[PDB]
Chains A and B, each alone.
Chain A
Amino acid sequence: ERLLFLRSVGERNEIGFPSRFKSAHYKKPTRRHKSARQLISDENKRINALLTKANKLVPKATYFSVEAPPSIRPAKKYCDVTGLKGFYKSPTNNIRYHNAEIYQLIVKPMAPGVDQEYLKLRGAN
């Protein structure tokens, strides 16, 4: 009953291998994995390759120009535990904290390996 519903939706939307939508010339090439990380690097080395070809006319609009530049005003320090205003920073594991009770309750009895995951959020590893 419940298991017999999904086969009905199955026989509504099948496309056979002789697909009626794609063209007669099919010729599908082999497909790599091509993750999102390596596309940045291969675009980067393509831009560097074209620049090294050109300098030995100057391109201006690139992918490194379309991203946001870093800020000029100083950033705001916040407590790593509560998200309030961080007045103090511990000298051992470099974790900002709000006041004394937060420090004695969380920061002092803290196990190693947790301070990295706390600093992961703001990227301070």
Chain B
Amino acid sequence: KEETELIEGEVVEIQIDRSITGGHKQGKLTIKTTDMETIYELGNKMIDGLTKEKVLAGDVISIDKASGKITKLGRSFARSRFVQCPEGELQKRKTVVHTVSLHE
């Protein structure tokens, strides 16, 4: 039995900023659930992990901070795949019960 801390929400707006030379990258990410909304300041490796596996506005994504793996759960219900916007807190500590055989 192990627990990990996870991020789940719907992407509101993404800003990537480049300098004159482009040596450093600044960024801001706005993400919300049905109960809260927040804005995060991004560093270089999060910006590189967001540019890879394109993430646009209105996408529902799951972010693992400690491993850097980000999965696209789908798209939110916004006509303006289709999943619903997550509810509750955005920083969730989730417990996953593993079962592994002796042969593995």
A residues sitting closer than 8 Å to B (CB atoms) are: 87-91, 97, 99-100, 103-104
Contact = CB atoms under 8 A, between A and B. Distances in A.
Interface of B: 12, 30, 35-40, 88-91
Contacts of A99: 36, 89
Contact of B35 (A87, A90, A104): A104
Nearest to A87: B91
A90 B38 contact: yes
Nearest to A97: B36
B36 A89 contact: no
B67 to A, nearest CB: 19
6 nearest A-B pairs in the assembled complex, by CB-CB distance: A88-B38, A91-B39, A100-B35, A103-B36, A100-B36, A91-B30
A87 B9 CA distance: 15
A89 B38 contact: yes
A88 B90 CA distance: 9
Given A88-B91, A104-B35, A104-B36, 19 more contacts: A87-B38, A87-B91, A88-B38, A89-B39, A89-B40, A90-B37, A90-B38, A90-B39, A91-B12, A91-B30, A91-B37, A91-B39, A97-B36, A99-B89, A100-B35, A100-B36, A100-B88, A100-B89, A103-B35
A103 B88 CA distance: 12
B102 to A, nearest CB: 40
A90 B31 CA distance: 10
Contacts of A100: 35-36, 88-89
12 contacts: A87-B38, A88-B38, A88-B90, A89-B40, A90-B37, A90-B38, A91-B12, A91-B30, A91-B38, A100-B35, A100-B88, A103-B35
A91 B15 CA distance: 13
Nearest to B41: A89
Contacts of B39: 89-91
Nearest to A101: B35
Contacts of B37: 90-91
Contacts of A90: 37-39
